[PDB]
Amino acid sequence: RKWAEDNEVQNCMACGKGFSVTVRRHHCRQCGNIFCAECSAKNALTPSSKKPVRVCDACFNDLQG
Ligand SMILES: O=P(O)(O)O[C@@H]1[C@H](O)[C@H](OP(=O)(O)O)[C@@H](O)[C@H](O)[C@H]1O
Ligand SMILES: [Zn+2]
Ligand SMILES: [Zn+2]
């Protein structure tokens, strides 16, 4: 519900491509947006949980430091 768990996305937010059998879907755990394998191709380690959380390219560098 509060998180974008394929509830009805089927479309990245940035590239906004229609997720298909070729491209997968990945949402940013920080902002909470759905990004395609190309937009979500960046992860960063946060001191909040000591683990690399999946996030888009921007937030990845915005939270990595
Ligand atoms: O990739 P799938 O097997 O279909 O499932 C993915 C997981 O729920 C991912 O969790 P994560 O962000 O914790 O990886 C999420 O980012 C993606 O939107 C989902 O596609
Ligand atoms: Zn994308
Ligand atoms: Zn983000």
Curated annotation (Swiss-Prot):
Residues shown, of full length: 1347 to 1411 of 1411
Effect of residue 27 to A: Abolishes phosphatidylinositol 3-phosphate binding and endosomal location. Abolishes pH sensitivity of the FYVE-type zinc finger domain
Subunit structure: Homodimer. Binds STX6. Binds RAB5A, RAB5B, RAB5C and RAB22A that have been activated by GTP-binding. Interacts with RAB31. Interacts with ERBB2. Interacts with SAMD9 and SAMD9L. May interact with PLEKHF2.
Other notes: Antibodies against EEA1 are found in sera from patients with subacute cutaneous lupus erythematosus and other autoimmune diseases.
Protein name: Early endosome antigen 1
Annotated compartments: Cytoplasm; Early endosome membrane
Consequence recorded when altering residue 54 to G: Strongly reduces phosphatidylinositol 3-phosphate binding and abolishes endosomal location
Effect of residue 25 to A: Abolishes phosphatidylinositol 3-phosphate binding and endosomal location
Consequence recorded when altering residue 26 to A: Abolishes endosomal location. Abolishes pH sensitivity of the FYVE-type zinc finger domain
Stretches annotated zinc finger (FYVE-type): 6-64
Signal peptide segment: none
Physiological role: Binds phospholipid vesicles containing phosphatidylinositol 3-phosphate and participates in endosomal trafficking.
Consequence recorded when altering residue 31 to A: Abolishes phosphatidylinositol 3-phosphate binding and endosomal location
Consequence of changing residue 28 to A: Abolishes phosphatidylinositol 3-phosphate binding and endosomal location
Record: residues binding Zn(2+) 2: 28, 31, 56, 59
Comment text on domains: The FYVE-type zinc finger domain mediates interactions with phosphatidylinositol 3-phosphate in membranes of early endosomes and penetrates bilayers. The FYVE domain insertion into PtdIns(3)P-enriched membranes is substantially increased in acidic conditions.
Residues where Zn(2+) 1 binds: 12, 15, 36, 39
